[PDB]
Write a protein that binds this ligand. Structure first.
Ligand code: 3YH
Ligand code: CA
Length: 223
C-alpha cells in the first residue's frame, strides 16, 4: 500500500498473510477452512497466517495453518490475468474470534464511486522499495469501466475492476496481491495487478469477486 495508513492491530480480522518462508501474498478468510486469494499468487508449500499485525514478530494472536489444497480457477490465464482467483483450503479449521474472522462474499457487484477498504503488507513507495511490518490500509473508490480502460496499456476484461486515484499517490502495490478489497462489508475485490504503483494514470486493478460466487460456493461444497 502506497499512501495509506496503519490499520491498527487486528482491525481487518479477515486479512491473511501467505508465507513460504517469507510473506509473499495476502488472502481473505471466507470461512473457518477456506481462504480466497489471487491465482497469480499460486505456489506450493503455502502457510496461511491468521491474526497477524506485525508479520515479523510473534504478537500473541496468530494462527499459522498449512494449506492442504489449492485450487486455481479453471480459466486463469496469466497472459491476460483474466480470472485471477484461487481458493486455498486449510489443513485444520481456524478458531474464529474477534481477531480472526470471515468476510462475506458479495451478493451483488459494487458500483463505481463506492468506497472500499484495501489492505496488505505490500511495498509502500511508488519510487523505490519499503516494506512495512504491520498491516496497512487504504480507502479507495471504484473507478468507472471507461476511465479504467483509458488508463491502461493492457486489455481489461469484465472480471476486473480498477480503483484508486488517477492523480496517483494512493494505490496497492507488490506484496498486497491476493489481499481483500472490501466494500460495504463484502469481499468485492482481490488485489490483482498494476503498472508500477501509485503512478499517474496507472490505477490498481482487482478481480471482480461478485462474478465468482457460484464457483466459490460450489468448489467449497465439493472439497
Ligand atoms: N499498483 C497496483 N495496484 C499493484 C498491485 C499489485 C502488484 C503490483 C505490481 N508491482 O510491481 C509490478 C506489479 C504488477 O502488477 N505488474 C503487472 C502489470 C501488468 C500485468 C498484466 C496485466 C494484464 C495482462 C497481462 C499482464 S502481464 N502479467 O502479462 O504483464 C501483470 C502485472 C501493482
Ligand atoms: Ca505477528
Amino acid at each position: 500500500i502506497v499512501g495509506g495508513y496503519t490499520c491498527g492491530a487486528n482491525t481487518v480480522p479477515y486479512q491473511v498473510s501467505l508465507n513460504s518462508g517469507y510473506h509473499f501474498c495476502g488472502g481473505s478468510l471466507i470461512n473457518s477452512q477456506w481462504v480466497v486469494s489471487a491465482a497469480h499468487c499460486y505456489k506450493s508449500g503455502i502457510q496461511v497466517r491468521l491474526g497477524e499485525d506485525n508479520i515479523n514478530v510473534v504478537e500473541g494472536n496468530e494462527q499459522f495453518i498449512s494449506a492442504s489444497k489449492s485450487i486455481v480457477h479453471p480459466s486463469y490465464n496469466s497472459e491476460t490475468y483474466n480470472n485471477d482467483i484461487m481458493l486455498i483450503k486449510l489443513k485444520s479449521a481456524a478458531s474464529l474470534n474477534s481477531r480472526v474472522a470471515s468476510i462475506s462474499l458479495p451478493t451483488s457487484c459494487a458500483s463505481a464511486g463506492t468506497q472500499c477498504l484495501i489492505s496488505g503488507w505490500g511495498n509502500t513507495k511508488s519510487s523505490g522499495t519499503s516494506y512495512p511490518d504491520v498491516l496497512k490500509c487504504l480507502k479507495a473508490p471504484i473507478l468507472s469501466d471507461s476511465s479504467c480502460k483509458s488508463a491502461s496499456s493492457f486489455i481489461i476484461t469484465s472480471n476486473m475492476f480498477c480503483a484508486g486515484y488517477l492523480e496517483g499517490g494512493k494505490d496497492a502495490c507488490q506484496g498486497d496481491s491476493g489481499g481483500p478489497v472490501v466494500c460495504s462489508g463484502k469481499l468485492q475485490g482481490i488485489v490483482s495487478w498494476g503498472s508500477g504503483c501509485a503512478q499517474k494514470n496507472k490505477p490498481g486493478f482487482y478481480t471482480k469477486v461478485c462474478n465468482y460466487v457460484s464457483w466459490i460456493k460450489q468448489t467449497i461444497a465439493s472439497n
